[PDB]
């Protein structure tokens, strides 16, 4: 919660549309209509979400993230959960 | 340089929709800073900037403003109004000087950019805010 609060305070907009920035940069809610830096950098292991609207620079993102202690913990979970979701969705497809 | 004194002079009267002040108002669309013009005889309430001072008042006049000079030269460049569409424009009446801000807004983020209207540059003021006087007499009082 501390990172969310400090980002919202820093970016001159306290979650009024900063939640929009988070959900458009992280959850892919921002389309490629206007280019920004809405991605995660592994260089410092931080996700940048600077909304440089219309190439007019508004430094918004570039805030820290964390690195997995073991890539297996999430990669194996993904490789299992994905197939699980496929199976459950096919089952509900047959039911429907 | 005529883009802030002559073209500003060639700017029709159009009171920008401020929030507090009812004084004379119009802003000039430039690539060298926004330009106000208020001619009322002997207390200049004028707001004139260049790229340098708009850069400064971007980097220090607001708590969160990472917008470079090019950002505001574009915002003014992407501005067609000596008026306000609502670039949010608002007035905080702290002095008789017309507080005329052109926010860091480009149909999107209302990024913070506030004003304390300084006593603008007298070179672009006294040259072409007194031209109203003799031009106005010599034109109006004869053609009417």
User: What is the DSSP code string of A44-67?
Assistant: TTEEEEE--GGG-------EE---
Encoded tokens for A29: 């809610």
d(CA A19, CA A30): 12
d(CA A76, CA B30): 58
A12: contact with B, CB 8 A cutoff: yes
The number of C-beta contacts closer than 8 angstroms across A and B is 40
Chain A: give the shortest CA distance to residue B112, in Å: 6
Contact assessment for residue B36 and residue B47, using Cβ atoms and an 8 Å cutoff: yes
- Taking contacts as CB-CB distances below 8 angstroms, the residues of chain B near A60 are 109
Query: Quick one: CA dihedral B74, B75, B78, B82, positive or negative?
Result: negative
Q: Do A58 and B112 touch (CB under 8 A)?
A: no
Q: What is the resolution of this structure in A?
A: 4.5
Contact assessment for residue B97 and residue B46, using Cβ atoms and an 8 Å cutoff: yes
> Which residues does B117 contact at the CB level (< 8 Å), separation at least 6?
B36, B45, B46, B47, B95, B97, B98, B99, B100
Contact assessment for residue B90 and residue B105, using Cβ atoms and an 8 Å cutoff: no
Of B72, B65, B83, residue with least CA distance to B33: B72
Q: Is B60 helix (H, G, I), strand (E, B) or coil?
A: coil
Q: Do A53 and B67 touch (CB under 8 A)?
A: no
Contact assessment for residue A7 and residue A63, using Cβ atoms and an 8 Å cutoff: yes
Query: Quick one: CA dihedral B113, B117, B121, B126, positive or negative?
Result: positive
For helices A18-25 and A2-10, give the axis angle rounded to 10 degrees.
110
> Which residues does A71 contact at the CB level (< 8 Å), separation at least 6?
none
Q: Which residue of B has its CA nearest to A21?
A: B109
**Phi, psi (5° rounding) for residue A61?**
-85, -130
Tell me which method was used to determine the 3D structure.
cryo-EM
d(CA A17, CA A93): 37
- How many residues does the structure list for chain B? 144
- What are residue A39's DSSP bridge partners? A48
Give the β-pairing of A37-41 and A46-50. Answer: antiparallel
> Which residues does B49 contact at the CB level (< 8 Å), separation at least 6?
B33, B34, B35, B57, B120
């Amino acid at each position: 919660e501390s990172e969310i609060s400090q980002e919202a305070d820093d970016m001159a907009m306290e979650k009024g549309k900063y939640v929009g920035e988070l959900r458009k940069a992280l959850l892919s809610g921002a389309g490629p209509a206007d280019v920004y830096t809405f991605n995660f950098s592994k260089e410092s292991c931080y996700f940048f979400f600077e909304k440089n609207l219309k190439d007019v620079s508004f430094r918004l993102g570039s805030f820290n993230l964390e690195k997995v202690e073991n890539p297996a913990e999430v990669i194996r979970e993904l490789i299992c959960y994905c197939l699980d979701t496929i199976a459950e969705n096919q089952a509900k497809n047959e039911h429907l | 340089m005529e883009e802030l004194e002559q073209g500003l002079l060639m700017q029709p009267w159009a009171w920008l929709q401020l929030a507090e002040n009812s004084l004379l108002a119009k802003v000039f669309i430039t690539k060298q800073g926004y330009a106000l013009l208020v001619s009322d005889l002997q207390q200049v309430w004028h707001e004139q900037v260049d790229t340098s001072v708009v850069s400064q008042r971007a980097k220090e006049l607001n708590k969160r403003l990472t917008a470079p000079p090019a950002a505001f030269l574009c915002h003014l460049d992407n501005l067609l109004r000596p008026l306000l569409k609502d670039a949010t424009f608002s007035c905080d009446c702290v002095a008789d000087a017309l507080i005329l801000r052109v926010r860091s807004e480009l149909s999107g983020l209302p990024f913070y950019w506030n004003f304390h209207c300084m006593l603008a540059s007298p070179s672009l003021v006294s040259q072409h805010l007194i031209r109203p006087l003799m031009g106005m007499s010599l034109a109006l009082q004869c053609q009417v």
